């Protein structure tokens, strides 16, 4: 649900990034490239949509990066194989920003749910 | 911090590194005090002290003319602790220092009536006790909430005097026998 092919690759490395923007309502940013298992962010919106409403659309500022290549475990003493994992990784970018009112950040309350690390909401 | 209170001129306090006690109509309250906290009498009224700034007189003081109440109950004040009960009758006599409490099993369980709360009895339907302790006034009140616990339905035993406590419910409500 990211690329459709265009060859494997990628490496590692942590720090911060660049993708922060002055929000119009009530922002929310990551703080370093924390932990989101792809098949975690594959439960980021639905969990932010248990029943917030019949309809309703806002905005995010990220997109699945990934592949990792994990390989079996019969005898790890070789090269590689293929991804079969997936991950997003980010900086301190926006990802929510509500536009209602009384609700405030109800869906930015169980966002921290699928978040082993720290991801404040802030506001702007 | 406090100081004001309600009591005429019929009581005297010590002034000896914590040894104090009351001496009115039956009291001799246990006092025991530190060393950084003391204060001496100043007449029919009292005063406030602060021989040392900060957190040193706000853990053991700023509420000293308060525990006086623990002794006020009797030296001039009253005492009563009055409750009612509905868990199978209301009977309790002392004939010494051993109320029997008529409820449930032949298997005794008798408690040992202390000095000051040792019961009087007069009215059976609702025991009366001259608890001049203020240590075991509400505790004894609680002496029947650890075993004979009231039924979680109608409005029995444990009750103060008249509140919106109501009687517990569940699914609906009914009772017979």
């Amino acid at each position: 649900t990211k690329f459709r092919k265009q060859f494997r690759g990628r490496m590692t490395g942590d720090a911060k990034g660049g993708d922060y923007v002055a929000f119009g309502d009530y922002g929310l940013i990551a703080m370093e490239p924390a932990w989101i298992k792809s098949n975690q962010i594959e439960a980021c919106r639905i969990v932010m949509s248990r029943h917030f409403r019949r309809g309703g659309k806002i905005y995010i500022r990220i997109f699945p990066d990934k592949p990792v290549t994990k390989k079996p475990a019969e005898t790890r003493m070789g090269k590689g194989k293929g991804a079969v994992e997936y991950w997003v990784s980010v900086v301190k970018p926006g990802r929510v920003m509500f536009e209602v009112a009384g609700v405030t950040e109800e869906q930015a309350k169980e966002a921290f749910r699928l978040a082993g690390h720290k991801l404040p909401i802030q506001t702007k | 911090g406090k100081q004001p209170i309600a009591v005429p001129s019929g009581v005297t306090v010590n002034a000896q590194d914590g040894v104090f006690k009351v001496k009115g109509p039956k009291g001799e309250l246990t006092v025991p005090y530190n060393t950084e906290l003391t204060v001496r009498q100043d007449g029919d009224q009292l005063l406030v002290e602060r021989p040392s700034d900060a957190q040193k007189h706000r853990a053991l003081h700023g509420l000293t003319r308060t525990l006086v109440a623990n002794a006020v109950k009797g030296v001039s004040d009253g005492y009563t602790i009055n409750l009612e009960l509905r868990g199978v009758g209301f009977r309790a006599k002392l004939t010494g220092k051993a109320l029997e409490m008529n409820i449930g099993y032949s298997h005794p369980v008798i408690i040992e009536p202390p000095a000051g709360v040792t019961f009087a009895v007069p009215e059976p339907t609702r025991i009366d006790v001259s608890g001049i302790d203020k240590q075991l006034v509400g505790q004894v009140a609680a002496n029947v909430r650890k075993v004979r616990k009231p039924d979680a339905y109608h409005g029995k035993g444990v009750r103060f005097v008249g509140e919106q406590i109501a009687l517990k419910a569940g699914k609906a409500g009914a009772t017979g026998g």
Binding site: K16, Y20, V21, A22, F23, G24, D25, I29, A30, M31, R53, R54, G55, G56, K57, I58, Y59, I60, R61, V91, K92, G94, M97, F98, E99, V100, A101, P120, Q122, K124 | -
Partner: protein, 173 residues
Amino acid sequence: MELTAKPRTPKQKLDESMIAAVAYNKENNVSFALDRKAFDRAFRQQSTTGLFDITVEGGETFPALVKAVQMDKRKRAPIHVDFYMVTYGEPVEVSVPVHTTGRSQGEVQGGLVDIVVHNLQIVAPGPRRIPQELVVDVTKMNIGDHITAGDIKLPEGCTLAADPELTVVSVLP
């Protein structure tokens, strides 16, 4: 709301409460500082709306405005931003925001609160000021109307950037 300070280094720019500060007025560079108490009176109600003074240590009096907003990336400790001061003859960067406000007449078919997540607008402003008076977000969200960026209630004059046709608020419930 005073000034003073000096430090040509990032020493007192990374020490508890302070900032970094920048100035480049006509024959007036240097990098001051100042504390950071009620130093978040930018995007609140003072966003170019009005222009007081400052009384800097020694000479002159420059009104100036706010020069957009910025806060801080991720956290909330606004790392150094910027600060415009009307005294130049040709920079850019204007702060003409576009909000979202109301009950959201989205429950007509299906649609929530006016989203928008950007932080950039088709704007221009000649001199350097950036007034405070504009709406655009409302106007019967449905179809056969819409209200975005291209002309609107536009500051004062016309606009100049590159290609006048961003996106901003829009509708699409």
